[PDB]
Amino acid sequence: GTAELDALWNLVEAQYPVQTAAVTTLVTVPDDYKFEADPPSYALAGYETSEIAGLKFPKGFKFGVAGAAIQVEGAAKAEGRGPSTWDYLCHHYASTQCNNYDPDITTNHYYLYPLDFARLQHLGINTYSFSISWTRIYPLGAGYVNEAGLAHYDAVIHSAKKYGLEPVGTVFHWDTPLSLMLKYGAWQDTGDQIVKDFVTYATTVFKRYGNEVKTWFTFNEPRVFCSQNSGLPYNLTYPEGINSTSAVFRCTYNVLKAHGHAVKVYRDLVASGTIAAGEIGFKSDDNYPIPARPGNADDEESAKRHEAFRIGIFAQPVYGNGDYPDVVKETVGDMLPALTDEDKGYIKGSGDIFAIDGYRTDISHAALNGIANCIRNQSDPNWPVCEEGSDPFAHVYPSGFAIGQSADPLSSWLVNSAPFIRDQLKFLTQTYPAKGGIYFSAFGWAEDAEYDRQLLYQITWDGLRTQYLTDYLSQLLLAVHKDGINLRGALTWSFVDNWEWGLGMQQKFGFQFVNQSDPDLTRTFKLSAHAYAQFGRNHLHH
Amino acid sequence: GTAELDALWNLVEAQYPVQTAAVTTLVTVPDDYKFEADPPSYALAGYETSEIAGLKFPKGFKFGVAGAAIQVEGAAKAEGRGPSTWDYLCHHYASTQCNNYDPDITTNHYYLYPLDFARLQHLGINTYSFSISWTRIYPLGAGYVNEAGLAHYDAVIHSAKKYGLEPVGTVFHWDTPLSLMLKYGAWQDTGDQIVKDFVTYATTVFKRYGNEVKTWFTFNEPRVFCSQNSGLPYNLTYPEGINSTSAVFRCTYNVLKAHGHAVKVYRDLVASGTIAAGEIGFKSDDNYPIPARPGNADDEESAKRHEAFRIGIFAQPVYGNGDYPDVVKETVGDMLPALTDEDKGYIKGSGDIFAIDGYRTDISHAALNGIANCIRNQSDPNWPVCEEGSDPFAHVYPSGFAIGQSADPLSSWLVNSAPFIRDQLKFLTQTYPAKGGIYFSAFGWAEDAEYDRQLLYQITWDGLRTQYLTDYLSQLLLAVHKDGINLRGALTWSFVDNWEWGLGMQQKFGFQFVNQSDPDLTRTFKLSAHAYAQFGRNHLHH
Ligand SMILES: OC[C@H]1O[C@@H](O[C@@H]2[C@H](O)[C@@H](O)[C@H](O[C@H]3[C@H](O)[C@@H](O)[C@@H](O)O[C@@H]3CO)O[C@@H]2CO)[C@H](O)[C@@H](O)[C@H]1O
Ligand SMILES: OC[C@H]1O[C@@H](O[C@@H]2[C@H](O)[C@@H](O)[C@H](O[C@H]3[C@H](O)[C@@H](O)[C@@H](O)O[C@@H]3CO)O[C@@H]2CO)[C@H](O)[C@@H](O)[C@H]1O
Ligand SMILES: *[C@@H]1O[C@H](CO)[C@@H](O[C@@H]2O[C@H](CO)[C@@H](O)[C@H](O)[C@H]2NC(C)=O)[C@H](O)[C@H]1NC(C)=O
Ligand SMILES: *[C@@H]1O[C@H](CO)[C@@H](O[C@@H]2O[C@H](CO)[C@@H](O)[C@H](O)[C@H]2NC(C)=O)[C@H](O)[C@H]1NC(C)=O
Ligand SMILES: *[C@@H]1O[C@H](CO)[C@@H](O)[C@H](O)[C@H]1NC(C)=O
Ligand SMILES: *[C@@H]1O[C@H](CO)[C@@H](O)[C@H](O)[C@H]1NC(C)=O
Ligand SMILES: *[C@@H]1O[C@H](CO)[C@@H](O)[C@H](O)[C@H]1NC(C)=O
Ligand SMILES: *[C@@H]1O[C@H](CO)[C@@H](O)[C@H](O)[C@H]1NC(C)=O
Ligand SMILES: *[C@H]1O[C@H](CO)[C@@H](O)[C@H](O)[C@@H]1O
Ligand SMILES: *[C@H]1O[C@H](CO)[C@@H](O)[C@H](O)[C@@H]1O
């Protein structure tokens, strides 16, 4: 091994070493694998509305699940991988930033992916969304390439297709190479090295997999990702001139450039015939919130500010007119870099497909101390949106009632807001049109206190997750038939309980349970998985 | 004699005294009382299915709520009340038996009943089920009567009727006078003084209220109650030869005798014209489970034994042939006093109406070591039912999936088993026929971890309780029209988060939240409260 690689992992493991999973050997799926038995036939009763009878998704609709490399894989040091910022963060600040978990092992999907795909095939899933661990490809972020890393995902893509699973690839899902952060501040780079290094990485994976993967996303939820750059460990290494309030908007600019340059490479690769033709975008999230008091110009202004800061700041340069929303530039000023002419050439139109992580719709209350007062105070707790961002407002009507069912309070951003899906999709497809249509790239549930159950039968009958997915899929189906949305697919987060960033393995978003108390991390289907399978059975073509 | 109440309350308050609520006056309800606003109109959908469309409950159907004196009243020492066994227990074993709560104050419904009823009227409730604290009437259980106690419930009954709530009265809901337990044991009385004392007590309340209260239950869930007499504080004072076990079955007989004698008096009072004619029974609970493996003779046997020990042991003497179930006679008997013919003369036919606290339906797995070996070993953990009684069996098919959604793990006995309700009602009304029909006398939900929520909007959108109540009401509604069941009403446990026995105020059963972190214990409506209200509008007569 290369010494700089060893130094980085020594650094990360200075307080505690990377833990090694029970089993570390590509598992083999016996042809006689026995799935656990189906739930009672009555369990799925009355989840569906009669309003969707006979309706089918379009031919080719992507009906699938989502995971992310660092969230499901484990094998943090296997086969030459280098450390990311999250390996460092959680090996150094586990008790204050990571709920005493780390991503060393997670669900062990790095070694168990063949079994997972077999279990996904049993439910009729037809699409598998995954992310590439950058550090499996470039262990130092730049420089030498790790052939074992490229080869792992070769094997991953082939088994999935073997199990009927169309692979959909995200190049970057938040697992920043630690090395690039130390060298020059990674996404806070005041220069352009992060773009050069990212495009090289993207070129390699495009060349290696572009013949097999025909739907690509550059970045997963860049607004959420860049907002993290205001925190540890990014703020141990800010470049000179960089604050922790602008680490988010310098990241915004660097990310928009990385996306544009990468899409050009992807399109050049297609136009040269090197890889099969496909579609590329990035996954947006959040929403265009409803005013707390309808018709009130203040609530509408804070709703617009929210859309612009949570969606427009990335989607308007790419799928709209090619510039930032006007409200963002005016409030942030010189913290947000201006788009040079060359930048707009790459960024504007650099999205074949729109993708929305449509977990929910919020409610926007204008700041009680005034939006005009708030936008002028970077120290205001509601800056820069200048709505009331705290939970007792963002989810609550003046009536005091919530917009909808709340999920686990540790993921209090999450609510069941199915009635609003069709409105978001009309807004997104009219404002950020993409020639390839729109994906529902991530929706899912954290059932309240599911981590405190100790007996499996209590876990597997997961009613509120099971009806979220049904509510959401139903509105998705009506968006196609009643609204003509060019909806390309529905991907649920996630297929297994996994490592949910700062919340670790405590928070359960899976429709399969993962027995952390089992060295084998053995798997078992929840009711919500069978509801997902059946909705597929009723509303997919075959 | 005297009012040696002081000796008794000093005993109870020996470790710490009874706490006094912040409000100890009768509240007055302003005519302009403003209710909190309704939830979004787009709520309540997908609960009511298409299958119960156009169906109505019978004219006069009691569509109401249930509470109990020691669970909602508080005022444990107000206006002359004597102590109950639960006052003693929770002031002495708070940390080990009462989850560090006591019923001193509870929801303070003793003083807030006018506001509670005004709020119930706002939802269109027409029936209010309540119990009388025996110790408010006879503070020493027998002897001197507390006129203030009798007069309090006069004011409650008159106010309830004023708010459109037909009052339904339960004579005894587990609050045994401590004095009677100490004097000669409670229901473990080897003589017959407890029957005399109860009958004297029942007569007083029948005379005072029978012109206003026309539906009566003697005992709430006596099988559950008598099983409590195997625990503290009852087992500090058994009058030998009564050992634990020999405590549950002496109680069953004394209660059956108490029930039969009290019902006879009730009938003499009606027949003499002293009180308006009404109906009287008792509230059964539990269920006749389903065999884990259908057609298996062992699972069918343990299911039958379960019904017999949980329903038949009280219901067969009262509504059936007048004797214990044969399987009960065969296993116990040497612990169970024989029902004399004079006993049978009072007990047989002493139920004008049946009532089932139909929380759930269980699954019966025959004991893994054989029923025959379990029944002959009083020390087997599965004696005397000799099914597998533990949670991983009682709720689980051999397939490993649950019978239905589980509730809060501290009330793990509770599951949503709506699909089996109709099957339960046919068995009960064909096996234990009553001329007045059958009441669904309690059902309700303990929403998982609702006690851990910190923000009101998260508490009030209670999706699975809303679901539970609509699912059950829908099956009740289908039971009348498809099965012709003479179902007389539906009463939900409960209208407010109350004091659940040993769990104290931690467990949340209300369709209104009671902010126990208030000096006023302010009530706020949950979604299930409006769901209960909405179902009434859609399916009641009025
Ligand atoms: O399963 C995890 C879940 O996380 C979700 O992110 C949530 C919101 O979508 C996102 O807007 C919000 O943004 C936070 C950021 O994470 C915090 O670090 C902090 O800086 O404040 C921001 C808001 O100002 O984060 C939420 C979770 O914390 C993802 O959307 C979802 O895909 C899942 O990954
Ligand atoms: O408070 C919630 C709910 O509790 C219900 O009682 C539960 C079961 O119905 C009942 O069968 C069970 O009986 C227990 C008993 O409490 C124990 O002391 C011991 O004897 O084991 C028995 C089971 O074999 O108790 C359950 C709650 O503890 C009530 O019926 C209902 O009204 C509610 O109060
Ligand atoms: C560096 O990032 C850290 C941690 O991610 C920020 O830590 C937060 O600090 C604020 C201010 O005290 C606390 O209120 C937060 O609760 C901390 N967040 C959590 C939970 O991690 C820290 O402020 C950032 N440092 C700088 C440069 O400001
Ligand atoms: C998660 O795995 C643990 C460990 O394997 C399980 O605990 C064991 O359960 C088996 C059931 O066959 C028992 O035979 C063992 O005795 C248990 N081990 C212990 C700790 O005593 C646990 O049941 C699993 N949890 C779930 C939800 O499946
Ligand atoms: C007496 O009661 C307590 C619970 O109240 C119980 O633990 C104990 O086992 C009971 N029986 C005996 C043996 O006294
Ligand atoms: C209780 O007494 C019965 C007889 O009434 C006896 O058979 C049983 O073994 C005793 N058990 C104890 C000591 O709990
Ligand atoms: C009775 O059951 C106990 C366990 O509950 C067992 O240990 C004891 O040996 C049994 N006695 C017989 C002979 O069944
Ligand atoms: C209960 O009331 C207290 C004080 O008024 C308040 O702080 C708290 O938010 C209330 N509880 C809820 C969750 O509504
Ligand atoms: C995976 O890695 C482990 C290291 O603990 C080995 O023991 C195993 O043989 C496999 O190579
Ligand atoms: C009891 O009466 C007092 C006044 O004596 C009130 O303040 C209270 O609200 C309740 O009505």
Can you spell out the DSSP letters for B117-181?
HHHHHHTT--EEEEE--HHHHSTTSSSS--HHHHHHHHHHHHHHHHTT-EEEEEEESS--BHHHH
State the best of B361, B461, B513, B530 to mutate against chain A, taking most chain A CBs within 10 Å: B461
**CA–CA distance, B447 with B386 (Å, rounded to integer):** 30
Among A60, A233, A221, smallest CA distance to A131 is for A221
Task: For residue A235, give both structure tokens.
Answer: 């703020």
Contact residues, chain B, for A38 at CB < 8 Å:
399, 401
Q: How far A126 CA sits from the closest chain B CA (Å)?
A: 25
Counting from 1 in the atom list of ligand 5, the atom nearest the Cα of B235 is: 1
A40 to B396: CB separation less than 8 angstroms, yes or no:
no
Q: Look at the block and give the residue holding tokens 């110009």.
A: A297
Q: Is A241 on the interface with B (CB under 8 A)?
A: no
| Rounded Cα distance, B499 and B509, in Å | 9
Amino acid, res. A352: D
* Whether A406 and B42 lie within 8 Å, measured CB to CB: no
How many whole angstroms separate alpha carbon A155 and alpha carbon B12? 72
Secondary element (H or E) of residue B280: strand B279-285
* Nearest residue, CB atoms, B458 vs list A398, A406, A419: A406
User: Residue B511: which of B522, B500, B527 has the closest Cα?
Assistant: B527
Distance from Cα B243 to the centre of ligand 5, integer Å: 10
* Atom of ligand 6 minimally distant from the CA of B378: 9
Kindly report the number of other CB atoms within 10 A of residue A455's CB atom: 16
Q: Which residues of B touch A42 (CB under 8 A)?
A: 419
Residue among B119, B120, B73, B58 nearest B439 (CA)? B58
Q: How many residues does chain B have?
A: 542
Q: How far is CA A270 from CA A181, A318, A523, in A?
A: 32, 19, 39
| CB neighbourhood size of B400 (10 A) | 15
Residue B25 alpha carbon to ligand 10 centre in Å: 5
A342 belongs to the catalytic site: no
The beta-carbon neighbor of B37 closest among A36, A400, A412 is: A400
The token duo for A184 is 């020059």
Residue B137 falls in which region: left (phi positive, over 0), alpha (psi -120 to 50) or beta: alpha
Nearest-angstrom CA–CA distance, A389 and A306 = 10
A283 touches chain B (CB under 8 A): no
DSSP reduced 3-state for A491: strand
Ligand 3 center–CA A230 separation, angstroms:
8
Ligand 10: residue whose CA is nearest its atom 11: B27
Mapping DSSP onto H, E and C, the string for B187-215 reads CCCCCCHHHHHHHHHHHHHHHHHCCCCCE
Check if A461 has its Cβ closer than 6 Å to any atom of ligand 1: no
Residues in Cβ contact with A38 at an 8 Å cutoff, skipping those fewer than 6 apart: A530, B399, B401
Q: Is B296 helix (H, G, I), strand (E, B) or coil?
A: coil
In the structure encoding, which two tokens stand for residue A23, read together? 């089993």
B378 lines ligand 6 (CB under 6 A): yes
Contact of A28 with chain B, judged by CB distance below 8 Å, is answered with: no
Distance from CA of A110 to the nearest CA of B (A): 28
Q: Best of B51, B403, B406 to disrupt the A interface by mutation (most A CBs within 10 Å)? A: B406
Residue A388 CB–ligand 1 contact under 6 Å: no
For residue B282, what are the contacts with CB-CB under 8 A and spacing of at least 6?
B217, B218, B219, B220, B222, B259, B314, B318, B351, B355
- Token digits for A4? 């700089």
Note every long-range contact of B533-538, with CB atoms under 8 Å and residues 24 or more positions apart, other chains counting. B533/B123, B533/B124, B533/B125, B534/B44, B534/B48, B535/B48, B535/B469, B535/B470, B535/B473, B536/B63, B536/B123, B536/B124, B536/B125, B536/B126, B537/B124, B538/B48
Distance CA B64, CA B218 (A): 19
| Active-site residue, from A48, A73, A221, A388 | A221
CB of B390 within 8 Å of a chain A CB? The answer is no
Cβ–ligand 6 distance for B246 under 6 Å, the answer: yes
* Residue B165 CB neighbours (<10 A): 23
DSSP B212-244: T--EEEEEE-HHHHHHHTTSTTGGGS--SS--H
Give the ligand with the smallest distance to the CA of B521.
8
Query: In this structure, what are the phi and psi dihedrals at residue A31, rounded to the nearest 5 degrees?
Result: -60, -25
CA distance B172 to B386: 30
Rounded to whole angstroms, how far apart are CA atoms A185 and B4? 80
Going by their DSSP bridges, the two strands A512-514 and B363-364 should be labelled as unpaired
Provide the 8-state DSSP code for B333.
S
Rounded CA-CA distance A501/A492 in Å is 17
- CB A515 near ligand 4, within 6 Å: yes
Q: Does A38 touch chain B (CB under 8 A)?
A: yes
Nearest CA to ligand 4 atom 28: A456
Closest Cα to residue A72, out of A36, A29, A116?
Answer: A116
With CB atoms and an 8 Å threshold, state whether B455 touches A400: no
Query: Chain B within 8 Å of A401 (Cβ-Cβ)?
Result: yes
Q: What are the two backbone dihedrals, phi and then psi, of residue A140, each rounded to the nearest 5 degrees?
A: -105, 15
**Ligand-binding site membership of A46 (annotated):** yes
* HSE value, Cβ hemisphere, 13 Å, CA-based, for B276: 10
Looking at chain A, the residues that come just before a C–N gap of over 2.5 A are: none
Contact at CB, A402 and B467, closer than 8 angstroms: no
Using alpha carbons, select from B149, B192, B542 the residue that is nearest to residue B346.
B192
A390 touches chain B (CB under 8 A): no
The secondary structure of residue A173, as a DSSP letter, is: S
* Cβ of A285 below 6 Å from ligand 1: yes
DSSP reduced 3-state for B335 = coil
Query: CA B261 to CA B251: how far, in whole Å?
Result: 15
* The two structure tokens encoding residue A538: 């009723």
Side-chain half-sphere CA neighbours of A455 within 13 A: 19
Closest CA to B540 of B500, B490, B479: B490
Task: Flag whether residue A41 sits within 8 Å of chain B, measured between CB atoms.
Answer: no
How far apart, in whole angstroms, are the C-alpha atoms of residue A527 and residue B474?
22
Interface touch B406/A461, C-beta < 8 Å: yes
Contact A463, A407 (CB under 8 A): no
Annotated binding site of B for Ca(2+): 46
Ligand 3 centre distance from Cα of residue A407 (Å): 25
Residue positions of B annotated with a catalytic role: 221
How far, in Å, from the CA of A501 to the mean position of ligand 9?
26
Q: For residues A283 and A440, what is the distance between their CA atoms, to the nearest angstrom?
A: 9
Asked if B410 has any chain A CB less than 8 Å from its own CB, the reply is: no
B99-130 burial: b if 16+ Cβ within 10 Å, else e: bebbbbbbbbbbbbbbbbbbbbbebbbbbbbb
- Nearest Cα of chain B lies from the Cα of A461 at a distance, in angstroms, of 5
Pairing of strands A405-406, A438-443: unpaired
The amino acid that residue B435 corresponds to is K
CA of B521 to the centre of ligand 10 (A): 14
Distance between CA atoms of B12 and B16, rounded to whole angstroms?
8
3-class secondary-structure state, position B403: coil
* Residue A206 φ/ψ, nearest 5 degrees: -60, -50
CA distance A276 to chain B (A): 44
* β-strands A415-416, A405-406 pairing: antiparallel
Closest CA to A495 of A28, A156, A123: A123
Q: How far apart, in whole angstroms, are the C-alpha atoms of residue A463 and residue A466?
A: 5
Pairing mode, strands A415-416 and B354-357 = unpaired
By CB neighbour count within 10 A (0-12 exposed, 13-18 middle, 19+ buried), where does B271 fall?
exposed
Question: CB neighbours of A273 closer than 8 A, spacing ≥ 6?
Answer: none
DSSP per-residue string spanning A267-335: HHHHHTTSS---EEEEEE-S--PEESSTT-HHHHHHHHHHHIIIIIHHHHHHHSSSS--HHHHHHHGGG
Residues composing chain A: 542
Q: Residue B351 has which token pair?
A: 């139920």
Closest C-alpha among A293, A281, A224, A289 to residue A423: A289
d(CA A298, CA A370) in angstroms, rounded, equals: 8
Q: Whose CA is nearest to atom 13 of ligand 6?
A: B243
B414 near B359, Cβ under 8 Å?
yes
Q: Which domains does chain A have, with CATH numbers?
A: 3-539 (3.20.20.80)
DSSP B476-487: HHHHHHHH---E
Residue A515 CB less than 6 A away from ligand 3:
no
Task: Report how this structure was experimentally obtained.
Answer: X-ray
CA–CA gap between residue B212 and residue B155 (Å, rounded): 12
Tokens 């017959």 correspond to what residue?
B192
Supply the residue whose CA is at minimum distance from atom 11 of ligand 1.
A224
The answer to whether B452 contacts chain A (CB < 8 Å) is yes
8 Å CB contact of A463 and B416: yes
Task: Indicate the helix (H) or strand (E) that contains B356.
Answer: strand B354-357
Distance B450 CA to ligand 1 centre (A): 24
Reduced DSSP (H G I as helix, E B as strand, rest coil) percent helix, strand, coil of chain A, to 5 = 45, 10, 45
Range A100-131 burial, b when 16+ CB lie within 10 A, else e: ebbbbbbbbbbbbbbbbbbbbbebbbbbbbbb
